[PDB]
Amino acid sequence: MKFVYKEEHPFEKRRSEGEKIRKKYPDRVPVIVEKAPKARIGDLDKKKYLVPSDLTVGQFYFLIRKRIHLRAEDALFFFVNNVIPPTSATMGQLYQEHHEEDFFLYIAYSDESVYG
């Protein structure tokens, strides 16, 4: 979508990389994570993540929370295709439903729970 990663890598490059990684690690899903525009929240030093399929969204929330150094009180919301995924879903289910044509799963994050 509005991701910076797609403006620095063309589709053919992303799709080729995504297909290989899905072959090199069939039990992992490649995830691109970027801050949503207009969001007031800390930045993420790295945006490309290789995540085990059985990790839940709630466990990825916490992992991302630490990388941004968010307190447990501070709000954090994920958006996949403008929808907030359930915390009880796994990253494997989320990837299988929502992966784009380059075989990447795209997640935006924000301090706001409303699209946005």
Binding site: R28, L50, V51, P52, L55, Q59, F60
Partner: peptide
């Protein structure tokens, strides 16, 4: 850049 692989810790 490079990929960040994640490893879940055991309870």
């Amino acid at each position: 850049n490079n990929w960040i692989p994640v490893i879940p810790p055991i309870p």
